Design a protein around this ligand. Sequence first.
Ligand code: MG
Ligand code: MG
Ligand code: MG
Ligand code: MG
Ligand code: MG
Ligand code: MG
Ligand code: MG
Ligand code: MG
Ligand code: MG
Ligand code: MG
Ligand code: MG
Ligand code: MG
Ligand code: MG
Ligand code: MG
Ligand code: MG
Ligand code: MG
Ligand code: MG
Ligand code: MG
Ligand code: MG
Ligand code: MG
Ligand code: MG
Ligand code: MG
Ligand code: MG
Ligand code: MG
Ligand code: MG
Ligand code: MG
Ligand code: MG
Ligand code: MG
Ligand code: MG
Ligand code: MG
Ligand code: MG
Ligand code: MG
Ligand code: MG
Ligand code: MG
Ligand code: MG
Ligand code: MG
Ligand code: MG
Ligand code: MG
Ligand code: MG
Ligand code: MG
Ligand code: MG
Ligand code: MG
Ligand code: MG
Ligand code: MG
Ligand code: MG
Ligand code: MG
Ligand code: MG
Ligand code: MG
Ligand code: MG
Ligand code: MG
Ligand code: MG
Ligand code: MG
Ligand code: MG
Ligand code: MG
Ligand code: MG
Ligand code: MG
Ligand code: MG
Ligand code: MG
Ligand code: MG
Ligand code: MG
Ligand code: MG
Ligand code: MG
Ligand code: MG
Ligand code: MG
Ligand code: MG
Ligand code: MG
Ligand code: MG
Ligand code: MG
Ligand code: MG
Ligand code: MG
Ligand code: MG
Ligand code: MG
Ligand code: MG
Ligand code: MG
Ligand code: MG
Ligand code: MG
Ligand code: MG
Ligand code: MG
Ligand code: MG
Ligand code: MG
Ligand code: MG
Ligand code: MG
Ligand code: MG
Ligand code: MG
Ligand code: MG
Ligand code: MG
Ligand code: MG
Ligand code: MG
Ligand code: MG
Ligand code: MG
Ligand code: MG
Ligand code: MG
Ligand code: MG
Length: 248
Amino acid sequence: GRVIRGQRKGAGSVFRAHVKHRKGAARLRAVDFAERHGYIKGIVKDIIHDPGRGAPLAKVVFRDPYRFKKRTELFIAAEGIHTGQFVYCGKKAQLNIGNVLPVGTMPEGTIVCCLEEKPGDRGKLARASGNYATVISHNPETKKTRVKLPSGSKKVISSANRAVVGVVAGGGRIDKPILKAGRAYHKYKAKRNCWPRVRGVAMNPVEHPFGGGNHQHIGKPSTIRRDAPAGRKVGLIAARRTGRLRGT
RNA sequence: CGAGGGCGCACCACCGGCCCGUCUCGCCCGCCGCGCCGGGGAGGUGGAGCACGAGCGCACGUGUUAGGACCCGAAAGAUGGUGAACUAUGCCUGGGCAGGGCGAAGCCAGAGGAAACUCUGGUGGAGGUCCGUAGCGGUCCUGACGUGCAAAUCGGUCGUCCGACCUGGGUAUAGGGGCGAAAGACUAAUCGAACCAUCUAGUAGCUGGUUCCCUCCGAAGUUUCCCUCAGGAUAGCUGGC
RNA sequence: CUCAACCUAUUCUCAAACUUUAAAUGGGUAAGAAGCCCGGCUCGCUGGCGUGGAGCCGGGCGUGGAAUGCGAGUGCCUAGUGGGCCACUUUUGGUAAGCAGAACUGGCGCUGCGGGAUGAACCGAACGCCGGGUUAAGGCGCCCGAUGCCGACGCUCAUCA
RNA sequence: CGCCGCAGGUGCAGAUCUUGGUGGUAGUAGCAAAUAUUCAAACGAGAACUUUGAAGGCCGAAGUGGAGAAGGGUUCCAUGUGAACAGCAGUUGAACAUGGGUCAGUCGGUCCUGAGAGAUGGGCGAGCGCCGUUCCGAAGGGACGGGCGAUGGCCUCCGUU
RNA sequence: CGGUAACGCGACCGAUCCCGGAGAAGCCGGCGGGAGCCCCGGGGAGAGUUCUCUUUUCUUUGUGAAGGGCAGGGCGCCCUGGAAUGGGUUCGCCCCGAGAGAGGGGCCCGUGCCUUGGAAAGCGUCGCGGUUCCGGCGGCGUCCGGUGAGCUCUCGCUGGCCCUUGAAAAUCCGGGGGAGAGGGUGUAAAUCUCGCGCCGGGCCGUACCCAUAUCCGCAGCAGGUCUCCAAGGUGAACAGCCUCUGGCAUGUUGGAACAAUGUAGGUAAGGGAAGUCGGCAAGCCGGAUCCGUAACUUCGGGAUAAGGAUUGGCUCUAAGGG
RNA sequence: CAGGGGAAUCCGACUGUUUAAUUAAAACAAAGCAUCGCGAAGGCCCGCGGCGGGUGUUGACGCGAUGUGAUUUCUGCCCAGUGCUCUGAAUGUCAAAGUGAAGAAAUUCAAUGAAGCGCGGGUAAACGGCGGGAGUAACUAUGACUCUCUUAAGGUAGCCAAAUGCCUCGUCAUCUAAUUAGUGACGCGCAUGAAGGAUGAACGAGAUUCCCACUGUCCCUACCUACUAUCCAGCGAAACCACAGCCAAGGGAACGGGCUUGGCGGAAUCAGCGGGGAAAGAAGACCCUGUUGAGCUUGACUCUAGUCUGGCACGGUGAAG
RNA sequence: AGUUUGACUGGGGCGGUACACCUGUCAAACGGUAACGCAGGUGUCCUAAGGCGAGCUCAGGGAGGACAGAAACCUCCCGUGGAGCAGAAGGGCAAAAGCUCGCUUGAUCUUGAUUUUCAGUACGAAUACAGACCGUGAAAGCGGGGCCUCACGAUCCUUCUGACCUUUUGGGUUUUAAGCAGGAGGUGUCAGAAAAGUUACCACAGGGAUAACUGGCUUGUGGCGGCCAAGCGUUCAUAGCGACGUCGCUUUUUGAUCCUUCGAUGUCGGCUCUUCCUAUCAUUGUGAAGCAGAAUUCACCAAGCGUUGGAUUGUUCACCCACUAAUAGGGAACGUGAGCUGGGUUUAGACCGUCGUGAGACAGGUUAGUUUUACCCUACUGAUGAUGUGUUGUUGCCAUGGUAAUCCUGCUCAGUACGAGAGGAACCGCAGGUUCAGACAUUUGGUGUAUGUGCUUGGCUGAGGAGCCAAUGGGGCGAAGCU
Ligand SMILES: [Mg+2]
Ligand SMILES: [Mg+2]
Ligand SMILES: [Mg+2]
Ligand SMILES: [Mg+2]
Ligand SMILES: [Mg+2]
Ligand SMILES: [Mg+2]
Ligand SMILES: [Mg+2]
Ligand SMILES: [Mg+2]
Ligand SMILES: [Mg+2]
Ligand SMILES: [Mg+2]
Ligand SMILES: [Mg+2]
Ligand SMILES: [Mg+2]
Ligand SMILES: [Mg+2]
Ligand SMILES: [Mg+2]
Ligand SMILES: [Mg+2]
Ligand SMILES: [Mg+2]
Ligand SMILES: [Mg+2]
Ligand SMILES: [Mg+2]
Ligand SMILES: [Mg+2]
Ligand SMILES: [Mg+2]
Ligand SMILES: [Mg+2]
Ligand SMILES: [Mg+2]
Ligand SMILES: [Mg+2]
Ligand SMILES: [Mg+2]
Ligand SMILES: [Mg+2]
Ligand SMILES: [Mg+2]
Ligand SMILES: [Mg+2]
Ligand SMILES: [Mg+2]
Ligand SMILES: [Mg+2]
Ligand SMILES: [Mg+2]
Ligand SMILES: [Mg+2]
Ligand SMILES: [Mg+2]
Ligand SMILES: [Mg+2]
Ligand SMILES: [Mg+2]
Ligand SMILES: [Mg+2]
Ligand SMILES: [Mg+2]
Ligand SMILES: [Mg+2]
Ligand SMILES: [Mg+2]
Ligand SMILES: [Mg+2]
Ligand SMILES: [Mg+2]
Ligand SMILES: [Mg+2]
Ligand SMILES: [Mg+2]
Ligand SMILES: [Mg+2]
Ligand SMILES: [Mg+2]
Ligand SMILES: [Mg+2]
Ligand SMILES: [Mg+2]
Ligand SMILES: [Mg+2]
Ligand SMILES: [Mg+2]
Ligand SMILES: [Mg+2]
Ligand SMILES: [Mg+2]
Ligand SMILES: [Mg+2]
Ligand SMILES: [Mg+2]
Ligand SMILES: [Mg+2]
Ligand SMILES: [Mg+2]
Ligand SMILES: [Mg+2]
Ligand SMILES: [Mg+2]
Ligand SMILES: [Mg+2]
Ligand SMILES: [Mg+2]
Ligand SMILES: [Mg+2]
Ligand SMILES: [Mg+2]
Ligand SMILES: [Mg+2]
Ligand SMILES: [Mg+2]
Ligand SMILES: [Mg+2]
Ligand SMILES: [Mg+2]
Ligand SMILES: [Mg+2]
Ligand SMILES: [Mg+2]
Ligand SMILES: [Mg+2]
Ligand SMILES: [Mg+2]
Ligand SMILES: [Mg+2]
Ligand SMILES: [Mg+2]
Ligand SMILES: [Mg+2]
Ligand SMILES: [Mg+2]
Ligand SMILES: [Mg+2]
Ligand SMILES: [Mg+2]
Ligand SMILES: [Mg+2]
Ligand SMILES: [Mg+2]
Ligand SMILES: [Mg+2]
Ligand SMILES: [Mg+2]
Ligand SMILES: [Mg+2]
Ligand SMILES: [Mg+2]
Ligand SMILES: [Mg+2]
Ligand SMILES: [Mg+2]
Ligand SMILES: [Mg+2]
Ligand SMILES: [Mg+2]
Ligand SMILES: [Mg+2]
Ligand SMILES: [Mg+2]
Ligand SMILES: [Mg+2]
Ligand SMILES: [Mg+2]
Ligand SMILES: [Mg+2]
Ligand SMILES: [Mg+2]
Ligand SMILES: [Mg+2]
Ligand SMILES: [Mg+2]
Ligand SMILES: [Mg+2]
């Protein structure tokens, strides 16, 4: 009869992201005439750590083509780029790590870092550390490009979607065992209030579908239907299968 | 006074009669509408009827009932509000944590070896490291106290004491909601649904109470029916007129 | 020749759900005037018939047709109650029960009083306030009213009467 | 107040009844956590407790020391009083009464933003309103610069509009 | 305007605009500089002891801000030059042909010293006048040294940790650029972040308590309630114990006794858990030095395993420095 | 000032947290392991409402949802059941709307056929389940071996009278003089068992057993100290109270202070004491009843937010089939 | 989200249905009559098993007859029903009510009255009529279901049937709808709601109308006895026993019941402490034996005195070790929680196994889990006192009440009596111990703040000396007193 955790998470209050010390939204520069017809050269000024994010962020400085001013962008750092390096964004940019150019101008095997989901937004795909998409194929008619995402799924996008070249820095961060509840505490204190996770079977029936009983058993199939109401779909949601995954 | 005889009130029992419904049988009658028209009879039977009215209004008593309903009494339910000064959690901005033990990586030198390399002594000062203050907590005495110093305190003994550490202030989350390293814990000494006012004199087949005198009469705990078995209706038993 | 079965005549012992016979106590009815006896009339019922039955109309009969006691009939409104319990006797279940359950009458409940030392129910008796007399059941050594009778006849000795 | 009528918020021992008062308990339990007081004097009606002096002790700088924040709000400071209060007393008091006391350019607030809160535009909403905080706004009311001019005047010439 | 340069000089024209800096950053370790405190040796002044001794013991023995100069600390600043037989160097590190060592400079901080302030004040002493209660008057003094893994602040250098990287904004400044402005050689102009001078700074708070009696707990309640300063001895020590400065009167009463029962604290012959549900409670052990340490093990631990010896006082001797 | 120590068993890896005011634990958390969903027109969630809002200043090395719980070592069989999921394969049923027919119409009938459910696959680190029955070896006993039945499989590796074993104080060994305790072992185990089983250091105010040392826990009690109690001066409550207060037996609502019969009975008091007053504290929390509730659960009955699907409207312009 | 989750009931739950009916009995000779009384039955079955008429006689047995036998068919005789009538049982029935045939649809259409249960309400069932229309039989008649006693169902709603019926709202026609009368679809909790759990996280109103603990009745069961005497006892009923039977007692067992207590009597065990009982384990005094002695057994008077130390277990019980004269059994609110303890059971946390879909449950296991108050009355313990003898004191008496001692060992008797032997006593006497009691402190031990005297750490008084502080600084020895 009590609203469960997870249900309480959408209300936001105590479960909002801790964005106090975050350095800004990491985005490609907005598409303009220079990036649409030629290239624009920027210089990497600094590479900084963004709290709550495993990937480094590259502070990149460009020139405003229309007024005397310097523009500062907050790119996602592809692995290999360094300070004092020139990066080039645009259609006519070359195939180097850190450059930004449309997928349609790229060969059929190049991998990319901060890929646009739609032609004109900033980067949306393959942004977490160590991840990369791959350009699979092109359709010059209908101006489409098939790419492979870090999850292994194929996706058809516009050929004008921009991306950085290379993998995103931050390497195999998940290789190291955390080893310590304290290190997990510090890891999630920079992200959001989610970490110490109480099992549902350890709760009472009032705050969880799995709670209650004289033994800590679920008492019902942990797989739950997709159309289950909020407060009920806990466990394995719409699971096509369960078990050990021997075979693929 | 009077055997007998007569008219017989009210009322009672019975037999007839009449009115409406409805059955059965049956032959007639009426006409500015001749009809799928209208009326009539006899014999049963249903009616809270008729058969030379008794009602209406007012007052009083008793009984039943709807209402706060003889008086006091729930656990609850609903509407609208007030609280995070305690606590729970997130965030912001500050403050704080003796003295010792162990001795991680890195580094120096020496020694042994044919080499590969090994050994030895230092240096270094890591760690949700150890002993142990302040702090924080609260194991046992099932100690004290138990109309207390105290609506949870005190004594000794204890757990931890560089970290998932302790803490001030500022902020955010509000009741079927929050928050929870999860005990149904905590949410102003209140929590298996806070507090405040109202609906509300909530309902109670259940418990308690129910205020002057004398006189007369005087019970029942049984029948039948009831989601009936701590209650009713019903008949009985009672009193009054 | 023996042991069975079977039959016949006998013999022992029984029945809430067996019975020929069959009480006591018990239940119904009658013990008159709304009756009895004469004539007559009605009927669509019944019918050999003036039949049968019923109804109706007149008339005559009082020794008022057992005992005992008592004044009856009738209507309206109606409260409380709807936990009962006990005793003699009958009686079911149970080893039994101050158990559980029935029948009959009385009682307690609702009830005091005399007696049972004491006691809801046993025995006597039911109650206005008193005086005198007399009893009931029960008693009469002393408590404690009354045997302080020259009471009658026996029985009985208990170191748990 | 009696009598004849009328009308009731009309009669109390109870309700762990309501409010008020009062007993026994009972001059009882008790005034026992943190080592501790003593001598003399003064004032005074009055001294275990006030003041001064002397002595003996304690806190032992993580204090029983010296200063602040929050909170309190005059408790601060003199003088006086001895009603009540300070669970014994009091000549003392954070009590009572009468007076007095807080002085800033440079100590803070004030200013800034933080987590956050919150109007407007817009959207929703029966509605009080609430959602939202850059989102769906014609969101710059400013500027030494230059020009057009009014010469407003110590109209030379620079400030003004 | 000066210096090869780092950069310096008292100013050192300049808008819109652009760039940058400061504000503006975590925790921990180890070193070094400075101060305050503590300590040691003398010299003064005043007190204490003097039964005997003690040239003794105690107290006290200043220089604010803001300027100027000089130490001291720091520099990832410059010039010369070119290093292996590598060298320099730290407690640790670490540094170098991308320029070591060495020599010579530059800058920053300068809370330390001297100086203006400044001795006139303050303090300590010794006296003399009174203005019932004079910022009175007067004398004398306010001196010289030494130490340090000491404590506390502070400044700096260099490390470690993080799947943790430890605010923002007001506000102030520097630079780039050069639109413009100012005068015709005048005792000159625009202009000036240089020296001095003139005027002003409103509003609110400000007492006191800050707790075993000024707050909350119904109270003068053994509870709760955020901080700063922090002496001597012992000692590893902000431990415990004693003391100085400062504070207090035993925690809302006293007196007299010293029964039981209690609450708190001790001891106990011989035995040693036989008590009890159960070694509950109490007791044992304990610091430091020197030895010596098992099974097992995730090889890190176990480990202060277990077990044994020693420990005072006094008088010396060696060794460790500048 | 200032650790008693040793040998083991169980549980939890550790450090951490927890029921303020009876439970600090073996419970929660944890790293590690595993599974599930999701490529943004999305997953999960909030919201009365707005293309509103949180994750999200995010983007699969990420968010969200679960289980188990360090390391090591394994993690067996079963998809019948219930869930979940996947493609519809001629396909069964299946509402409104729409279509057709009859009728004068209301209306009736028929055709058509969305999701869902059925049918068919997958899935157990989803929930869960892992029994029987016969036959069978040259002493007997067992059954390596062969067939079956419900039906989906028959309990594998391990472990055990375990915190899980009724019988049970199981049997054997060991520890003791003596052991319902402990440890080791056995195992047809009422009713062990594999994301949890079994191990294994370190750790623990966790549960247990033994040994050394130590002692007033005890034999078996004594003495001492401080504060009380005690007496005094001052001050001064509360709980509770039908009336009260000596017993034995009787009878009685079956355990009397009162009544009956007996024993008997002497003012006012002080310090103690805990046998009685079925002492006080609280309208029993156990138990039942009530056509009194509330917290929670679920194919209980009846609904509902949200979601999936069809239809009508916004809703338009051209082509092909 | 809202609600529900029956009742009865020797507590409730589980189980049953005694919840609507029928038969026999209970039931006490009218009728009625209860319990979770006894023995049973019912929710159907039947176009005939209904209705008439006719004709037959059944069960069983005996005697016969080819196969044919203990049972196949046929015949005769006996046959009061001993068969059958659908079913449970009871009643009833013979040219019946049974069996076989023939014809049939009275199992139809109607109005009332009545009986049964009963309130004299309904339903159901039934009886006697009356009016139709029929069946059968020659007819009298008989028949409106079953030989009789059971076999079943309101309001509202639905459905069907009937009247050339009534209404359908200003009139008319036609659909439709509504009525009136009679059937049917059903309520089995059967006078008739529409209905799953859990709560140890729990709540409230109550109940001693009702369970769990004491007490009371009872005594099956437990325990302890007796009577008879078949047998056991080499023989021998009764030294000691006691089969088949039978009579009792007890309330330390467990049941049975539900009288008291639910505005609360604190619920196991242990520890502590007192008293009581005797159904006597030991000890005193005795009697009997299958009593030679020693040992043992039975019984009497008898409860004065005693009945212990431990391992395991929460245990009460149990079992073992060991000592002993003996290690008897019991009661007192299953004595004793303002006496304690809290191990157990019996709240809330948690783990396992089993059960359940789940929440949750488990006289299953395991771990952690607040034990409050006396100052009142009495009782008891001690302490003052009080009434009376004029005041007061000394010395006394004893009414009454209490009461206390206990058991063992060794020496001697005595290697004696007795006995074949092995063994093996007793009385008197002597020396000592146990348990208990009442004292006491000369001695030993304990205490020790004489704060007595040395030693000693840290600090403090300038040092010495003398001291002090550290809640008794520590430690050695220690008088007195207490013990
Ligand atoms: Mg978890
Ligand atoms: Mg839980
Ligand atoms: Mg739920
Ligand atoms: Mg569960
Ligand atoms: Mg008439
Ligand atoms: Mg009436
Ligand atoms: Mg009322
Ligand atoms: Mg409701
Ligand atoms: Mg707060
Ligand atoms: Mg640590
Ligand atoms: Mg530690
Ligand atoms: Mg306690
Ligand atoms: Mg729970
Ligand atoms: Mg009310
Ligand atoms: Mg009903
Ligand atoms: Mg009642
Ligand atoms: Mg009876
Ligand atoms: Mg009565
Ligand atoms: Mg009467
Ligand atoms: Mg009477
Ligand atoms: Mg009498
Ligand atoms: Mg008598
Ligand atoms: Mg008499
Ligand atoms: Mg007399
Ligand atoms: Mg009144
Ligand atoms: Mg009154
Ligand atoms: Mg009254
Ligand atoms: Mg007193
Ligand atoms: Mg006192
Ligand atoms: Mg001191
Ligand atoms: Mg202070
Ligand atoms: Mg006073
Ligand atoms: Mg004052
Ligand atoms: Mg005042
Ligand atoms: Mg100076
Ligand atoms: Mg150099
Ligand atoms: Mg001077
Ligand atoms: Mg001040
Ligand atoms: Mg206080
Ligand atoms: Mg208050
Ligand atoms: Mg005080
Ligand atoms: Mg004191
Ligand atoms: Mg005092
Ligand atoms: Mg001893
Ligand atoms: Mg000893
Ligand atoms: Mg023991
Ligand atoms: Mg013992
Ligand atoms: Mg202990
Ligand atoms: Mg060890
Ligand atoms: Mg743990
Ligand atoms: Mg583990
Ligand atoms: Mg805690
Ligand atoms: Mg607690
Ligand atoms: Mg605790
Ligand atoms: Mg693992
Ligand atoms: Mg996990
Ligand atoms: Mg599979
Ligand atoms: Mg379909
Ligand atoms: Mg299960
Ligand atoms: Mg196995
Ligand atoms: Mg086993
Ligand atoms: Mg076990
Ligand atoms: Mg033991
Ligand atoms: Mg074992
Ligand atoms: Mg598995
Ligand atoms: Mg008595
Ligand atoms: Mg009650
Ligand atoms: Mg209650
Ligand atoms: Mg009822
Ligand atoms: Mg409810
Ligand atoms: Mg359902
Ligand atoms: Mg009779
Ligand atoms: Mg009869
Ligand atoms: Mg015939
Ligand atoms: Mg009924
Ligand atoms: Mg009763
Ligand atoms: Mg018996
Ligand atoms: Mg014989
Ligand atoms: Mg009580
Ligand atoms: Mg009591
Ligand atoms: Mg005897
Ligand atoms: Mg005994
Ligand atoms: Mg008892
Ligand atoms: Mg008691
Ligand atoms: Mg108690
Ligand atoms: Mg316990
Ligand atoms: Mg529990
Ligand atoms: Mg505990
Ligand atoms: Mg005597
Ligand atoms: Mg005696
Ligand atoms: Mg000394
Ligand atoms: Mg000396
Ligand atoms: Mg001192």
